[PDB]
Amino acid sequence: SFVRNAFTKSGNLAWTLTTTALLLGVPLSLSILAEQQLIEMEKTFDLQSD
């Protein structure tokens, strides 16, 4: 059915968008997490210093 065709096409598009979002965000997210952890580490070191 045309309604079924629209449903499957929308599902495929959503799957594609989710796949792209994960692929382009997960490494970025890990980079942000690492940078944010490192700045916290420097923060802690300083508070130790003074």
């Binding site: 942000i32 940078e35 944010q36 700045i39």
Partner: protein, 35 residues
């Protein structure tokens, strides 16, 4: 359905213009993390 030889150039130019507008918009600046 036309898919002209000029359709490809029109699509690529439209994508380029949309991308240039998006990049030079405040939105791109927002994409940069605050930290």
């Amino acid at each position: 359905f036309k898919e002209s030889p000029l359709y490809t150039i029109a699509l690529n130019g439209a994508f380029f213009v949309a991308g240039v507008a998006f990049i030079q918009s405040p939105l791109m600046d927002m994409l940069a993390p605050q930290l």
